[PDB]
Structure formats: C-alpha cells, structure tokens
RNA sequence: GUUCGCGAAGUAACCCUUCGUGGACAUUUGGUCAAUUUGAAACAAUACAGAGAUGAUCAGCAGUUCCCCUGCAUAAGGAUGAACCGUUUUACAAAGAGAUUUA
C-alpha cells in the first residue's frame, strides 16, 4: 500500500486542535545505564567544630 | 429471507410522532448548550421507552441493504426509527452472515457503529469495553419494568424467555430469584449488543395482562453489561472455552507458519 | 517530539486489497482510547465509493507498547486479539505474561510515555522470538440440598412414558444436558436433523433449557413435525424395564427425550434455583438407572 | 417539581395524597434513617446525647412503619 | 449560548442585551458568575447594533417617519453613552464620546441657524464615522480577548502559570533569593554528610 | 454490603488502591530473579488467603 | 436554529462560540454598510456560515466624492426645511421595542409591506436637470459605461 | 440534452420532420459527527460542620502540590483561594560489670 496523506480544511469557527486541552502529566524518567558519581578520595579529620 | 428479504422495512414511528427533543422537566430553567435542566434537585430521570421493536414485524429489506451496509440502526432496536425503508443502517436481527461481515470490526465497536472504551462505565451499562468480549447481559430492574406486579420466580424468567429469544440466538438464560435479576448469554456479541440497546427501558407485560394501560407508568428495566460468573461451576467453563478457542487458533497460526516458512 | 513522529502502525486487513489509499491526517485529532491523550488521527477509506470510515482510535505509543495496528487493535503478527495472544504465550512459557491496564487517568498517561513493551510485545514485534514460539505451540499440538420437597414437580416430568412413533405430541423432554452445551447448539441439531433451517423466522421450536437443573424441553409448533423429529432419530436406548427412550446427538454429549404429552412450560423445572439443583442430582441415579 | 426536600413530614400520614407522591415522602423518611442509623455506631462518647438520637430513631421507624402501612 | 456553557441559567439576557440575574445568588454563584470585559463589551457593542437596527426596522415598518429616523440614528449615535453603557468596560471610549459630543455642537449651531431648539436635527453622518473607527481599533483587541475566553472554555486555563514580579510580592520573592544565597554558601562550607 | 469509595475531589483523583501508582520498576538487572519472583507471588497469594 | 436542543446541533453549538471572536468584524461590516437617508432599502451581499453561525456584509461602500457630498447636502437642506415648517416633530422612543419580546422576523413582518417615502429633496428641473436621474440613486451611475 | 457527422423514410426537390447510428461536450458529493434514559456540565436545596497566624479581634504577601476557579491577562481577586497542622527508630560503633550457655 502506498498512502496519500492530505489534510482536512477544517471549518475556522470549530476549534482546531479538537484533541487539544490543558491537562498536566508526570512523565516516567527512563534510565538505562547509572551514571558513577566520579568523586576522588576515601582528609576528613572533624574538629567537632562546625 | 421468507420473514425478512421478502418484505421491506416498514416506518415504525412517524416523524411527527417521534418524542419532543427536550427531556421532562426535572429543573427550574432549561440549559440551551447541555440539553438538560439546570436549577434545582434533579430527581428521577428514567421513564418507560413508548415504543419497542417487533421484530418479525418491522424487519425488511432497507436502504443500507443495497449499499452493504456493516450497521444496524439504532432506532431500530428501540422501535423509534422514522425513515423506514428510506434508512441508511440495516432492519433486521443480526445473523451469522451479518456477523461475519462484521467480524474485522466487531473487535473495536458495537453492532450499531459506536466505538467501544477501555474499560467498563462505572454501573456497567452503556457501549462495552473492546479488552473483553462481553456476551453476557445483566437484566436488571424488572420490579420497575413489571409494574410491582409478583407473579412468582419462574414466570419472571418466561418473560425474560420469550423476548430475548426473539433477538438472537442464546447461550444460556439464567434468573435468580433473590437476587431478582436474569443473566441472558448470547451466541454472539453481536446480538448481545443489539439486544441491549433493545430492551433498555422496556416492560415485560404482554398485553394478557391488566396493567397494559398503565405500562407507561412504571420505571423501566435496565439492561447491562455483566460481571464475571463467580461460581467456579461457571469458571471451570471459562477456561474450557478458553482453551478449545485457544487449539482452534493455534491451528489456524500454524498455517500461517506454513505459508511464512 | 511533536516535529518528528513515527508513521502510523496499521493492519494490513484494515487497509483492505486496493493499492492507493488517500488518507487523511489531522495534527491533533481525537485523544486516546488507551491513555487519554492526543495525536495524530488518521482515517481513510478502504474502496473510494464505501461508506465506513476506518479512524486510529489509539495513538502510536500505545500502539507501539502492545505492538498493535492503531484500527482495529489486532495483533501486528499472528492478527489475533491481545488476550488470546498473552493466552497464548502463556502456554509456552508456562508463566502468565500479562499486559495490565491502569484504570486511573493519571496512570493511563504515565503508563504511556514509558518506552517499554507490554505483555506478549517483546515475544511479537521480534520475527526471531515469535517463530520459535510458534514452533512451540506445535508440540502442544501433538498432545492434541437432601431437604427438598420436590415430589410435587417429578410428577409432571414423564420419567415412565416411551419414546415411540404411535404418540403425537407437540413437546419434549430433553434431559442428561450438561452445564455446557449452549442453548443454541441443541436448536441448531435439531434444525441440521429437519432441514428446517432459519428455524427462527417462522418459529418452528421453541426450547427452554435450565442448565441448572440439567434438563430441558423443545416445543414445535404443527405436530406432523413431531413425527419427523421422530423417524430422524434412529439410535435409541431401552431401559432394562422398557421404555425406550430417543438420543439426541451433539458431539461427544448424549441427551435423551421422552414424549411430554402436553405443553410443560417455563417452571416446570423448578420455581428456585437451590430447588433446581437437586432435580439434577435426582436424574443422576436415573440416568445411571437407564444406562446401567 | 417541588422537590419534598424542603417541607415537613408532613404530619398525618392518612391526609397524604396519591401513591406516586408518598413513595417520595417515604424515602424522605428512609434518608435520615440512614443518616442516624450511621450516627448510631460512632465512638464519640456521647451517651447522653445518643440516647435522646436513639429515641429519634425509634420515632422515625414508627414513621417508616406508617407510611408503609398508608401504603 | 456561551452563559448557558458556563453553567449559568439564573443570569438572563432579555432581547435588548441586557444582563440581570433572576435570583438573588449565593456568594459561590457571584464568584462563578464574574463575566469579564470581553462578554460585556461585546454584549455591549451587540446592543449597540440592535439599538441601531430596530430603528431602520421602525422606519421600514411605517411606524416612523424619514426625517425622525435620521434624527433617530442621529440621537443614538450622540448618546451611546446614554443608551447602552458601553463605556464602564472600556473608558477609552470616552475619547469617542467626547467625539460624537463636540460633533454634535459644531452640527447643530451650523443646523438650527434660524430655527429654535426643535429635535429635528439628523445629520448623523460625522458621528457615524467616530463609531466606524472605534470598531475598526477594537476588532483587533476583541478578536483576542474573546480568543482567550473560547479557547479557554474548549481546553481549560493553563497549568503552567508564572506569576510575574510586581510590588505587592518584591519583599517576597527578595526573601526567597536571600534564603537560598544563604543555603548555597553554608552548605559549601559544611564538613560532609 | 461493600465499602464505599471516597468520592473525587477534582477530575483526574487518583484511587491509589487500584493499581501500582506510579510503578517505578527496577533497573534490568543481570542476577537472574526468576525463582525469587515466584515465590514472592506465591508467598502474596498465599497471604492474601 | 431558532430552538436548537437536538443532538444533531452540538458541532453547531460550539460553532456560535467560535464566530464570537469574529463578531466585531461582522459589526463592522453591517454598520459600514448602513444606508444612508436617501434610500428606502439597500440590498447588501452577504457571506454566511452554511450552519448559520454569522453573516457578514461582504461589501465596502465606495461611493463619488463630489456625488456624495452633493447627496449630503441635498438632505442637508431637506432636514433644515423640514424642521422650519413642521409644528411638532417627534423623536422617537428609546428603546424601540420591548425586551421581552424577540426581533421580529423579516420575512413575515416587513418584507411583504411598502417601504415608505426616503427624505429626498424637492429638486429643481431646470436647474438640476443633469443630477436629477441619478443623484439619489443607491449605487449614482452605477451602468453608465 | 446540446453540437458535429453518416444512413433510411416522408414532405420535398438537397431544404424540413421523424428515428437509426458514430463522435465531441460534461466525470466520483458527504461523515472525526445517527434522533430522549446507559459514556458522563454544574448549581440550588436539606442536614451537619463554622472561619490563618492570637489570650482576644484584625491587614495581608508569598512558598510546595499528580487541586484548581474567575479574569483577555505574565495584572488582580478566589478565606493570606484551598490543601499543609499529622505520622515519626538501623550508614550505628568503641570501652567497662553480674546472670545463661557451649563443648
Ligand atoms: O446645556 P444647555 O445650554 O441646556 O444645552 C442643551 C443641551 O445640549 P447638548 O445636546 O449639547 O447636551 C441639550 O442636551 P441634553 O443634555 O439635554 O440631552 C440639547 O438637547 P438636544 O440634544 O435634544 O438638542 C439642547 O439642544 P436643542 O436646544 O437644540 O434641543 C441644548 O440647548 P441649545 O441647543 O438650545 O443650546
Ligand atoms: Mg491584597
Ligand atoms: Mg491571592
Ligand atoms: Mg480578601
Ligand atoms: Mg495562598
Ligand atoms: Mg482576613
Ligand atoms: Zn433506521
Ligand atoms: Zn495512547
Ligand atoms: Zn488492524
């Protein structure tokens, strides 16, 4: 099958976009792979200052 | 063919004779965009359908017929079309040659050309979900739909017998009397469709009977989608079907196997 | 991405045997059936002079995670329904996979945008994973209530009368009939044996099955057919008494018949559902009485 | 129209009307029996206050009692 | 058809293009029924139009005769101010007002030269010309503001709405800077963990 | 006679008892949960009975 | 769509809201179009909406400035004469109907009655023999090529 | 149906009428959409609850939220618009004593 695809000349009082309303979404986050979180080092010594 | 393609479909209602397009008044002012009543409570809304469909009577030959029409029509099922033979939808109860044209499409909507949802309406009623095919009804409210009349509780189900073997061919009919409901099983989905749409709101009186003067007056009887059969009686049956729709489809993707090779 | 979007998944089957298809795309038509939110509508026609418009009812991503056309939601492989296919696999891999569906509309959308598969859409959608599967089903293939007072309805049952040519009645009485074997399976023999077929246009039976009480009965209208319903029937069985009694024959199942005699009717095999029970459990010794 | 949530019971039960009229009535009592019913079992301590609501509850069955035996 | 969207019933339009509500409300419906500067202005630029038109009506019926209906458009058109209350929705149009006044000044001294102070005068056509502009400022500002109206009622408000800074919440939001300069420069200097 | 649901608030109120709320699953792991999975289930079920 | 609760006008429903943004362009148009006194009616050109959404005057007015301002002048005069010799002249009531009761519809109730006498001047013979065929036409030589 | 041909018949005398027969002209509408209950407006009303920081009464700004409403609005209102006011246990060790086990 080869398919024509045309657009439809829609009626500019209805709205277009009929599908179209301010709804909100969480997205997922899509991880595959971790990033190393690349820090150096095991000083540290705490003067109980602080 | 002898008590449908040899006659045509006959005008059940007249186009003056088809009810007002507002609904009873159930509020102070009308709502104009929303077909309804706006202020105040909002009662009662569901009123015995006044008309109903003989099937061996107004079945004939229409003018989706010609056209080879998928569909059939929706006032039909409710004895309210008014075009007649003039109609672009079918006349008739669904057959199995019907429902092999329909057989690509029944998968994503009904019999009547409405799309099928996700999942079920909340009360069960309406179109269906497309996830399960559902043949089985839930024929509810029949104290409404026979006037508190009392009968007893096998006569109930010889009602619900004899009109619902009108539309279509039946799996199984069963009514429990405690529970006061029946549950109608079709060979078809089809069928179970059209039946539904057919018998929302009507009365199980039969003109016998003295209240049919009064038939108007009552509630109506609702006619929804059924649960799942919880008696394991009924579950080992499920998944005997199951699996026997399971063999005949492994047959028929094994040859697709063969011609892919 | 809303600049660059995938190309619809569609059946083959709902595009239908003709090569040039126009179709018709709108930006943001309706929303998803699945997850509630827009897309691209495409529909088409499949001939230029029909009259059904074929819509996408779903959006590509959900079309993607079950691995179905977006028509008419059918199986992109194999063309079967998503329940029978996750039944399926299931045999195989002697695990339930399962596509599960949120009924919650923030879960509907969030479920969506992941970009995993569902179900059997990691087995299909891999030409390599679904043939060896196929090949896997092959091998399956070469496997290939005491207290009831219920002495007032026995009396209107036959139980004691024959089925011979010399009565003519109308009516009936179909018992040994299992909780399977449909209502329309038992009017269609009966039909196939007359040659009455389309039976339901001109009402020729009328049958009543309970299912429960394991029993039913079959009516014609214009006794002559009687007769024929009865030389149809050659197999018989006599009861070490007497009284031979007709079999009706679906596949693999046996149900007798006797002459009724009159019209029984709707209640005449019970008037309660834990009162039909036990006229089955009361044939059971009857049916075994007639065999054995 | 006119709703029966805005008036009275009304107070005898023989000078009510048609019977598609008292069956709205007898579920204006059936309401507040089911409010009160869920009233009943709470832990709120109360025990002065849900013995004068268990005799209001009494008064009411009696009500439900009459309009079922007008009916 | 737009206040039976809303879901308001109880606010009635008669067939002058007024609004007036039909009970005496709650103050859930008061805060429901808040119509903005774009309803109003447009109904009250339609009832300018069916004033306008229902005198070329009673003039085609025979009820009115020539010479007083261009002294009737000549009234409305000095008096739109007047007749329909246009201008509490928008008070620029004031500066139209005061056209259509100072106009009617230099027509009449020039008109009623020699003959009293009768009501006869319907040279309307410089103040046909004052409103002919204003509505040729206000498609372009209405045509928006009633685009946001019906797309807001066919798709909803937006959720991603920023509130801009301005002088009721500058002290605020000079708060939430300093709390978080004051975060960022402790939490650098902490040991760890 | 079944317990009632708390009725929705707004339109999109999520019944967080139907179904996994906002099902994060774990990273594909290489260590084989095969057998564990099972036994989880079965040990679900079985407090579910 | 005089009474519009059927099932069959819920696309046309929400048509009438998207011609409201358009609403003060068709205004405009119909107030650009207003005939002016000399003429009784003026058959304007319209483009509407095929679910009868809006009409708007497709026209402009373009009209001779020396014709127009002679026209004007001509009524000019006729208005000041007309208010010298009439003993009492009535201004009409605002508004000019109830509004309770709906505008009344044109084929019914004005368009099978005459219209009535436009304001036009006494005009000389002599004197304006070259104007007086055309001066107050609605569209002045509109076929003299 | 028009228009160009060709043929036959009659009136004709090459024109008119009739019906046979080639051409040419003109070429695939509409639907995301079916007409009351079962595919989704809301609000009023009954009843109950009674109102941020406080001892007490009164101005408010914000902030976070998979809550939004009105408004043309990125202005501003919506009770400071609302919700918040609860639940609360392990990166856990080092050192020093009396009962009890082990084998
Ligand atoms: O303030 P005044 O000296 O009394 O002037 C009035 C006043 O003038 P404006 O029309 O400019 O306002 C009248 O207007 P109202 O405020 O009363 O409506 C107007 O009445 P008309 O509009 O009916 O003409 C009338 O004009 P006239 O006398 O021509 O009727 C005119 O008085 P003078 O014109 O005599 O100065
Ligand atoms: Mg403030
Ligand atoms: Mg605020
Ligand atoms: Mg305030
Ligand atoms: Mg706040
Ligand atoms: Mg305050
Ligand atoms: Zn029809
Ligand atoms: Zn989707
Ligand atoms: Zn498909």
Known sequence: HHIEVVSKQMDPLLPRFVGKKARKVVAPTENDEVVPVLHMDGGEADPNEW | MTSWRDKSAKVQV?????????????????????????????????????????????????????????????????????????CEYLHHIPDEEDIGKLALRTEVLDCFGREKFADYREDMGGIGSFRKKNKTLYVGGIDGALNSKHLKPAQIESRIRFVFSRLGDIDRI??????????????????????????????????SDKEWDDRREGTGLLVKWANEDPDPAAQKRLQEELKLESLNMMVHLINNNTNSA | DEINEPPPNICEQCLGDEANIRMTKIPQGSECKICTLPFTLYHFKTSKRSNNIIKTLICVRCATQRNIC??????????????????????????????????????????????????????????????????????????????????????????????????????????????????????????????????????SLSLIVNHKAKCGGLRFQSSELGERFVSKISETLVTPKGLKRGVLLIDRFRIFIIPWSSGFSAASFGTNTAENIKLSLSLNKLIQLELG | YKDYSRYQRPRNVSKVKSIKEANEWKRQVSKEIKQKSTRIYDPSLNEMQIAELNDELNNLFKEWKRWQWHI | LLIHRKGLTYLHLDYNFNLKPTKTLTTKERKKSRLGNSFHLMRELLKMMKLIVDTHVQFRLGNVDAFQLADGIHYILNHIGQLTGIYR????????????????????????????????????????????????????????????????????????????????????????????????DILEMMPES | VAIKKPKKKYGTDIDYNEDIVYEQAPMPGIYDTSTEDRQIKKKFEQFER | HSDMASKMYNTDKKAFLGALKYLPHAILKLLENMPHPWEQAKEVKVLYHTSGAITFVNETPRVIEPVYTAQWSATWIAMRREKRDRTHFKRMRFPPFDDDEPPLSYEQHIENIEPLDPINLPLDSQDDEYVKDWLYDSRPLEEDS
Request: with cysteine; charged share 25%; glycine share 6%.
């Open chain 2, 174 to 207: 069963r009514y429990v009397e405690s529970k006061n409901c029946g549950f109608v099983k079709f060979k078809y989905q089809a069928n179970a469709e059209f039946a539904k749409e057919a018998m929302s709101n009507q009365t199980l009186l039969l003109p």
């Open chain 5, 89 to 184: 929705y928008k008070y620029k149009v004031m500066h139209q007002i005061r056209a259509c006044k100072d106009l009617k000044h230099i027509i009449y001294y020039k008109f009623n030269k020699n003959l009293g102070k009768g009501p006869g005068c319907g040279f309307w056509q410089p103040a046909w010309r004052v409103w002919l502009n204003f509505l040729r400022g206000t498609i372009p500002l209405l045509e928006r503001y009633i685009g946001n109206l019906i797309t807001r009622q066919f798709e909803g408000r937006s959720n991603e709405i920023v509130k801009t800074t301005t002088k009721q919440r500058l002290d605020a939001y000079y708060d939430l800077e300093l709390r978080n300069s004051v975060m960022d």
């Open chain 2, 14 to 86: 007249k186009e003056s004779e088809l009810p007002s397009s507002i609904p009873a008044q159930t509020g102070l002012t009308f709502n104009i965009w929303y077909n309804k009543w706006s202020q105040g409570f909002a009662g009662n809304t569901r009123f015995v359908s006044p008309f109903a469909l003989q099937p061996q009577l107004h079945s004939g030959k229409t003018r989706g017929d010609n056209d080879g029409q998928l569909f059939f029509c929706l006032f039909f099922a409710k004895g309210m079309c008014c075009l007649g033979p003039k």
């Open chain 3, 70 to 203: 977006q028509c008419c939601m059918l199986d992109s492989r194999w063309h079967i329904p998503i329940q029978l296919r996750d039944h399926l696999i299931s045999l195989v891999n002697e695990e339930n996979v399962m596509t599960e569906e949120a009924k919650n509309d923030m879960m509907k959308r969030f479920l969506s945008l992941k970009n995993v598969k569902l179900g059997g859409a990691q087995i299909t959608s891999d030409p390599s994973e679904a043939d060896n599967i196929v090949d896997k089903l092959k091998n399956i293939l070469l496997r290939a209530y005491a207290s009831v007072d219920i002495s007032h309805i026995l009396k209107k049952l036959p139980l004691n009368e024959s089925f011979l040519k010399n009565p003519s009645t109308k009516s009936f009485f179909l018992y040994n009939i299992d909780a399977s074997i449909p209502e329309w399976k038992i009017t269609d023999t009966v039909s196939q044996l007359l040659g009455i077929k389309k039976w339901k246009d001109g009402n």
